[PDB]
Specification:
The complex is a heterodimer of chains A (156) and B (39).
Chain A: E1 6-12, E2 19-27, E3 30-34, H1 35-38, E4 43-45, E5 48-50, E6 52-56, E7 61-64, E8 80-84, E9 92-96, E10 99-103, E11 106-111, E12 122-125, E13 131-135, E14 138-140, E15 146-149
Antiparallel strand pairs in A: 1-2, 2-3, 3-7, 4-5, 6-7, 8-9, 8-12, 10-11, 11-15, 12-13, 14-15
Chain B: E1 2-8, E2 17-18, E3 24-29, E4 35-37
Antiparallel strand pairs in B: 3-4
Classes of the chains: A mainly beta (156), B mainly beta (39).
The complex binds ligand A1B9K.
Region (Interacts with and activates NS3 protease) (chain B): 4-39
Subcellular location (chain B): Host endoplasmic reticulum membrane
Protein name (chain B): Serine protease subunit NS2B
């Protein structure tokens, strides 16, 4: 059905009314989202059906119709934008300078922005409009604020 | 059963709301894809 490049809402009618569980990126005929959003379950695009192709619970990522296509990376210096798609609200770009998640396996960028759970999977963009990761998997610090990682998959 | 609805183009918008800090945090990623604060 709808294979157009762009950002999409992931919705369900299982709960009350229509509830938004997450967000995703459609690019090069592939739908990219966070694993915890869909749990690897199939998706519907009109009468079209999207089946999972690749997924990893540790990375918290999943691609539909084909392999992971996003590969741009945060340069560690520049400001980025979170293209946030909140439940029931219009897509909105928020510019921020990312922080750092120091792990034993290397440093990853971090975005300290607060959005409801249904915003999980919103893309993070560089100054060219290339998706450098997905927002929606992170931690909660001392002041109750949420810090998400900049999650990027590996392109083959 | 889940479904997708388009929400917009993927573009950088000049002059957008600039907010949020840049913290440097020590974190740990478990086998279940869960991050946690290391102190
Ligand atoms: C806040 C921490 C403790 C949870 N981390 C999140 O990123 C969370 N989603 C989530 C849920 C289950 C799993 C994972 C991630 C990874 N694999 C299991 C989330 C994301 C946003 Cl954007 C808002 C949220 N509100 N509450 C939760 C929440």
């Amino acid at each position: 059905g709808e294979t157009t490049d762009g950002v999409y809402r992931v919705m369900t009618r299982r709960l009350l009314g229509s509830t938004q569980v997450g967000v995703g990126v459609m690019q090069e005929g592939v739908f990219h989202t966070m694993w915890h959003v869909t749990k690897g379950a199939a998706l519907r695009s009109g009468e079209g059906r999207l089946d999972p192709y690749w997924g990893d619970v540790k990375q918290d990522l999943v691609s539909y119709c084909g392999p992971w296509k996003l590969d741009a990376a945060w340069d560690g210096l520049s400001e980025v934008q979170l293209l946030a798609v909140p439940p029931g609200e219009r897509a909105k770009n928020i510019q921020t300078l990312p922080g750092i998640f120091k792990t034993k396996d290397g440093d990853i960028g971090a975005v300290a922005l607060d959005y409801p759970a249904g915003t999980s999977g919103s893309p993070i963009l560089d100054k060219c409009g290339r998706v450098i990761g997905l927002y929606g998997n992170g931690v909660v610090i001392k002041n109750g604020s949420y810090v998400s990682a900049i999650t990027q998959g590996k392109r083959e | 059963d889940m479904y997708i609805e388009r929400a917009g183009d993927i573009t950088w918008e000049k002059d957008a709301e600039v907010t949020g800090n840049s913290p440097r945090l020590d974190v740990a990623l478990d086998e279940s894809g869960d991050f946690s604060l290391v102190e």
